[PDB]
Amino acid sequence: LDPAIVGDEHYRVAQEVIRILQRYKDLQDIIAILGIDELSEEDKQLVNRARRIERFLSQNMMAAEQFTGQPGSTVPLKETIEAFDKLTKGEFDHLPEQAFFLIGGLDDLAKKAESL
Amino acid sequence: YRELEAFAAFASDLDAASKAQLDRGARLVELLKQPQYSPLAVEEQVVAIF
């Protein structure tokens, strides 16, 4: 992972997401004890964005067919990087909690959004 | 600068000198950062520190 041989969009996306996860891990128990009502507007927005980021990463696989009836999914790279940039921009914060579970692709996410 | 920023992280109204010192410390901490494979000579470091 380095901009010399990899596109810098990947580099900046990774940096933003890792900083988001670092701050979220730091603020975890603070949210747990003191409550979300004691946090700032930036704190609240970042907390929501981290919630979306953490739930968004999940995806189903073929091997789960033995365990669960849902068949797995596969996705290319450019679509994933575009989706991750869209998420880290915060344009999808309006999506519900349930729409961010076991999402393989953007079209699957949209169809899940329409289902609710 | 740490002794002030660790406390006033959630402070909106501060003493003017305290806020200015916090700004100076944050600026210096930002400035000291440096990339890899990038050696520096003494003269440009002196310029940057000044």
Place this chain on the structure above:
Amino acid sequence: LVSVINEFKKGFQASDGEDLEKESVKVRKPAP
């Protein structure tokens, strides 16, 4: 099953369910 559930739950019944400050007015008039 759900019809029997509805019928029974309809038939079924739920057994539960000094320092007192006074504020006055200031009048320049002599005391009557």
Place this chain on the structure above:
Amino acid sequence: TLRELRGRIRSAGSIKKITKAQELIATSRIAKAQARVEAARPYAAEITNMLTELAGASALDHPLLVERKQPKRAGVLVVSSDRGLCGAYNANVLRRAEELFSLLRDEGKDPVLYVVGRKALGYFSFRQRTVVESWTGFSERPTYENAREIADTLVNAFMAGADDEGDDAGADGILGVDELHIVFTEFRSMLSQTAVARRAAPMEVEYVGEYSFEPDPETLFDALLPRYIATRVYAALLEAAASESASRRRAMKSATDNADDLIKALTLAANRERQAQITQEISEIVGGANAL
């Protein structure tokens, strides 16, 4: 064990950091609250001066000025906050309310109570007592409109008991109240904040000893009193909020200072445990080594 100890250290250190941060939040809020509370003085002084001048040579008679012949009942309003972590603020308010209710029980009257704040709302809902009306959601930041409407409602309720004879409502048609009470807290100092209860429903006239009235003086008087009552109601709220914030800061400061001690003690215990484990390990390996 070890990992439980480390996790407790992490949790308590984070709690320490954020308790100090939110205590600084309260300290910052104190400044703006004190700046905001002290801006209504000129209007109150003017309304007092005008009331004094108008009543100086006016007729002394008004339903609010006079008293009901019978002590049928007595209303009362008690204020509370819209947030927790205040310390004994709620406890002090509730203790004052209970003491006042005990004092009023001497006369044998049946009072009705009005409450502001969600915490006292839940507290009294849990207990066996009626509450006619409650107000929440703006104790942190009030406005003149809320105080004005509250004063209007209370004045109308007091008027609605003019001819309350026995259990009969009379021409009022609704059982009314003959006495009102106010409960709040005052900012005596940054460290002195004593809950104060006052009675201000029936006006009393006192003479300390010793213009032109173009409209009807009586009508001016009648319209003038409700403004005075509303201004008093509005003035109470900022005082209550300031006292709330002042009580808020110290409890969290003390929570921080006490949270330090658990970190210290747990670190001591963990060091003792680890050294015991290592010395037992070396003793056992020695006993195994030399026995052969």
